[PDB]
Swiss-Prot record:
Interacts with SLC4A4. Interaction with SLC4A7 regulates SLC4A7 transporter activity. Interacts with SLC26A6 isoform 4 (via C-terminus cytoplasmic domain). Activated by X-ray, histamine, L-adrenaline, L- and D-phenylalanine, L- and D-histidine, L-His-OMe and beta-Ala-His (carnosine). Changing N64L: Reduced activity. It is linked to Osteopetrosis, autosomal recessive 3: A rare genetic disease characterized by abnormally dense bone, due to defective resorption of immature bone. Osteopetrosis occurs in two forms: a severe autosomal recessive form occurring in utero, infancy, or childhood, and a benign autosomal dominant form occurring in adolescence or adulthood. Recessive osteopetrosis commonly manifests in early infancy with macrocephaly, feeding difficulties, evolving blindness and deafness, bone marrow failure, severe anemia, and hepatosplenomegaly. Changing H91Y: In OPTB3; partial loss of activity. The gene is CA2. Substrate binds at T195, T196. Residues 1-256 form the Alpha-carbonic anhydrase domain. This is Carbonic anhydrase 2. It holds the Pfam family Carb_anhydrase. Its main location: cytoplasm.
Length: 257
């Protein structure tokens, strides 16, 4: 099945998921010189004070930190969005080396990693219904650069030994995702897709301009994870990023001058 090797990576996905060659695929390169400032965009409203993390899972593609999304406890609103979007999970994409790992790029620059906070539109009732709608999801994307440690990331890093291989989970309560945000909420936005199969064109992307800093040590721990299951040949979970896709007939809008 699909993955990030030579034989099963991004360049193969279209055979099982033809929407891979669609009109609104993600990620994309963000050309900062052609993204136009849109004064009509609102500030983003990130309301995570009541968030309830539950569990962390290695799904064989990344690790997901999952939240209780049975009520409006951690929500994203404002920005480019109409309505209310509930946080379901976050996860990262990262590289084998610090010079690659992000999915979005900025003037062709690749960051060491990218965080995706995934939210679904409450008007559709559940996640599975939301991903069938063009405005079903809002994903907040945050770039990671290597420098100073991110203190708020360390709780995640330190549990990763317990979910080394595909299908392992661990309890992961009381984690505050506010500790993963940069200072500024300035953003770019465009309409796109999930970046993994099934590649559904259901996402309003909100990509923050300001990266967070993580330490080399932190990212090194991500790279100790495995794609494989327990007692299978070890294949390090690295380079779990889809490259930039054609922008096609889209505009990327900036919230800031
Ligand atoms: C399959 C799946 C599920 C949730 C989120 C994403 N995504 O952001 O690519 C993909
Ligand atoms: Zn992602």
């Amino acid at each position: 099945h699909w993955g990030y090797g030579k034989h099963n990576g991004p360049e193969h996905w279209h055979k099982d998921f033809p929407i891979a060659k669609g009109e609104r695929q993600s990620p994309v390169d963000i050309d900062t010189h052609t993204a136009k400032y849109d004064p009509s965009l609102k500030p983003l409203s990130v309301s995570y004070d009541q968030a309830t993390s539950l569990r962390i899972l290695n799904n064989g593609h990344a690790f997901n930190v999952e939240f209780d999304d049975s009520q409006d406890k951690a929500v994203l609103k404002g920005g480019p969005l109409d309505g209310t979007y509930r946080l379901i999970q976050f996860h990262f994409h990262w590289g084998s080396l610090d010079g690659q790992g992000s999915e979005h790029t900025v003037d062709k620059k690749k960051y060491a990693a990218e965080l995706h906070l995934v939210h679904w539109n409450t008007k559709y009732g559940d996640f599975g219904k939301a991903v069938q709608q063009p405005d079903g999801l809002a994903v907040l994307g945050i770039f990671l650069k290597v420098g100073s440690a991110k203190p708020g990331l360390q709780k995640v890093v330190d549990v990763l030994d317990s979910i080394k291989t595909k299908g392992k989970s661990a309890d992961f309560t009381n984690f505050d995702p506010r500790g993963l945000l940069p200072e500024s909420l300035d953003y770019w936005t465009y309409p796109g897709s999930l970046t993994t199969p099934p590649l559904l064109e259901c996402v309003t992307w909100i990509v923050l301009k300001e990266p967070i800093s993580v330490s080399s040590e932190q990212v090194l721990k991500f790279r100790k994870l495995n794609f494989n299951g327990e007692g299978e040949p070890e294949e390090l979970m690295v380079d779990n990023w889809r490259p930039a896709q054609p922008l096609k007939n889209r505009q990327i809008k900036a919230s800031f001058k």
